[PDB]
Ligand binder design. Structure first.
Ligand SMILES: Nc1ncnc2c1ncn2[C@@H]1O[C@H](CSCC[C@H](N)C(=O)O)[C@@H](O)[C@H]1O
Ligand SMILES: Nc1ncnc2c1ncn2[C@@H]1O[C@H](CSCC[C@H](N)C(=O)O)[C@@H](O)[C@H]1O
Lengths: 159, 159
């Protein structure tokens, strides 16, 4: 499968957007606490996030716990410090588990995570006119790059 | 070049995100009024959009005006009602002008626009668990699909 991992996300609208993209694709959502916001059920529903119930979601109290519970698979780390493009790897094997790990809107990923995993750090190409892309936009780009390579498994090409 | 055209966008954060992706790539931003928010220079500064100045932006009072001022190029219309994938077309020619036209967060694209241009209506594939993707996410996906096909011209220069 395809997986998005959010390391300590900050801003509720970004995670709401990412959860929508996950519901839209069958991508799993992994949230590493602390979060910057509540995800209580009654609040999500009155906020009209009806799609949230359809997301395959897992919460973790630490990135250590995340790793322990997700030992198998291919792990990629999205960071502007990466020296490979997000499109440089093959995500076409539907039977594999691909994990794309994203940093905080403000802090990004911890430096040691980037350093320990540098040959799997991916930079979406940019001009020098911004420091970074929006978190939810980067998750949407990576999700649909993987699904493009897999020829859209489980998705409706037409209504 | 690559162009994103927003038909009467509603939510300031979506247009802020799309402007960020445009500054990040050199994609032109075309805004068809009425907009749902102020884009006065003083409001954008109050909102902290430091990259806005770098965006190649044009405003129009109508889609008719937009068409009159952009006669040459290839026009694609992003809608869940499309019957071709966003990846089904060739955007690889850097000398051509590719325009991707997006609808409103609430009403989408006008029915007559979809009908009249149906052969070039593009649907990003989705499951049945959501009605649509987030507007800014869809723009980011299309921008980076076009730049992928062109091998990221003008990006990652002198990082
Ligand atoms: N160009 C890009 N390439 C890869 N990931 C990106 C990206 N822009 C944003 N992201 C992702 O979005 C997250 C939040 S943006 C954080 C940016 C960072 N704090 C800075 O120095 O500006 C990042 O941690 C990364 O996972
Ligand atoms: N799956 C998808 N394929 C193509 N465009 C999409 C899309 N999801 C969202 N969009 C774009 O994002 C815009 C705003 S989403 C608006 C849709 C409307 N609220 C509804 O319930 O259906 C759309 O007009 C379209 O341009």
């Amino acid at each position: 499968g395809v997986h998005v991992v959010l390391y300590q996300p900050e801003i509720p609208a970004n995670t709401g957007n990412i959860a929508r993209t996950c519901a839209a694709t069958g991508t799993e959502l992994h949230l590493i606490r602390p979060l910057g916001f509540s995800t209580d059920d009654k609040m999500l529903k009155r906020a009209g996030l009806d799609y949230w119930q359809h997301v395959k979601i897992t919460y973790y109290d630490s990135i250590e716990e995340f790793y322990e519970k997700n030992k198998d698979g291919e792990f990629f780390y999205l960071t502007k410090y990466g020296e490979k493009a997000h499109t440089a790897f093959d995500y076409s094997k539907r039977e594999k588990d691909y994990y794309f790990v994203f940093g905080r809107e403000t802090n990004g990923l911890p430096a040691n995570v980037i350093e320990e995993n540098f040959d799997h750090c991916l930079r979406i190409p940019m001009t020098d006119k911004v420091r970074s892309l929006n978190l939810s936009n980067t998750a949407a780009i990576l999700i649909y790059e993987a699904f493009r390579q897999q020829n859209y498994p489980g998705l409706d090409l037409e209504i």
